[PDB]
């Protein structure tokens, strides 16, 4: 269609092939992964004990049949009869279902390659995004480009990494060189989210989602660049110096990504500009992006912070604290209510959906008299939309 559609014609003889696939494969597909989401999912972990473990063969197909229709749906929102929303729920739905742990330890190349090649169209896509966005929006190329990935390819990788982060699928799926796809990812995402265009005005959302969901998939501490060594995973101690020089590397883990600042500096910014109390439309980027990564970084990595293993402390990959994730959550809290006056937003709301794993792994004696300034303030304001527990 795309060879043909060029030259003579627009309506090709496969019309009732293409709609026999759109009105019932994809509704199928979706309906049929819905309702059995966990017999693929259960490997060795014994869900639904009563039976229904998935083969590793079934498992390979499964991720197999995702690559491929990420392959047929990127780059081509506007081909399909407007049903590309059904398309962009059927992967959501697949991402949930895929099984990274057994299909790459036990999986065939094409389709591990097939993965592969999915994230790092992935990523090039989200630097085309980049370029396009930033040093020019005069050309319809590009502005397909971004309709495309603000339709599709946020909300799929978002989902998938999720996936990724809850099931903790990223030690054993992201080892070599998507290492290095996905570090060009996150640098995309957080230059999206902190861009000065007026374009990403309508996807801050999204990307902030994503971004939350990339901090949470990610098995290497970014934030963090300083005890980078006691990693196991990280692809500067797996690949040794000379194939990370012959790859296209910064030979640099402090270097390899510059625009991100470190846990620290953003911390202190945070906390600097919650004693400030800016309005939220002045700095829209740290309330909507920034601060969901630092809960969803700082929830990942708390049980890998030292006090949750007092045994090998200096060798812990972070240096979380409790006392970090309660300052964290007394500025959130705090630069909510300093912006709770001036005519809302449902931001309030999202930003607290985001940090709810934060107040759940606050300790309770901790929540008792010690947030109890929150409920009082709380109840003090006439009316709050943020809904707290």
Not at 228 to 248: F, G, P, V, W
Request: glycine share 6%; aromatic share 8%; charged share 20%.
């Amino acid at each position: 269609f795309d060879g043909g559609s060029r030259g003579k014609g627009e309506h090709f003889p496969y019309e009732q092939e293409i709609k026999f696939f759109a009105k019932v494969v994809l509704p199928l597909i979706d309906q049929y992964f819905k309702n059995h989401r966990l017999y693929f999912l259960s490997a060795a972990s014994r869900p639904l004990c009563s039976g229904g473990h998935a083969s590793n063969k079934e498992k390979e197909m499964v991720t197999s049949l995702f690559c491929k229709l990420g392959v047929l749906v990127r780059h081509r929102i506007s081909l399909f009869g407007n049903d590309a929303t059904s398309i962009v729920n059927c992967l959501h739905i697949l991402g949930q279902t895929l099984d990274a742990r057994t299909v790459m330890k036990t999986g065939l190349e094409s389709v591990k390659s097939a993965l592969r090649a999915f994230l790092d169209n992935a990523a090039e896509d989200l630097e085309k995004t980049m370029e396009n966005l930033k040093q020019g929006q005069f050309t319809k190329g590009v502005t397909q480009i971004i309709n495309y990935t603000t339709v599709a390819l946020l909300p799929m990788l978002s989902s998938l990494f999720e996936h990724i982060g809850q099931h903790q699928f990223g030690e054993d799926l992201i080892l070599e060189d998507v290492q290095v796809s996905c570090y060009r990812i996150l640098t995309s995402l957080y230059a999206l989210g902190t861009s000065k265009s007026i374009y990403v005005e309508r996807q801050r959302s999204a990307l902030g989602e994503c971004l939350a969901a990339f901090a949470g998939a990610f098995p290497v501490a970014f934030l963090e660049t300083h005890l980078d060594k006691h990693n196991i995973y990280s692809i500067y101690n797996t690949k040794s110096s000379r194939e990370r020089a012959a790859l296209s590397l910064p030979t640099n883990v402090e270097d390899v990504c510059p625009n991100i600042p470190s846990l620290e500096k953003l911390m202190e910014e945070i906390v600097e500009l919650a004693e400030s109390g800016i309005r939220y439309t002045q700095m829209p980027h740290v309330m909507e992006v920034i601060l969901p990564m630092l809960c969803s970084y700082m929830s990942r990595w708390w049980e890998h912070g030292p006090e949750n293993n007092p045994e090998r402390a200096e060798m812990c990959c972070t240096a979380l604290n409790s006392e970090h994730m309660n300052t964290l959550l007394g500025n959130i809290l705090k630069i909510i209510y300093n912006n709770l006056g001036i005519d809302e937003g449902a931001w309030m709301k999202r930003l607290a959906v985001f940090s709810q794993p934060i107040i759940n792994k606050v300790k309770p004696q901790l929540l008792k008299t010690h947030f109890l300034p929150l409920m009082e303030k709380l109840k003090k304001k006439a009316a709050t939309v943020v809904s707290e527990e």
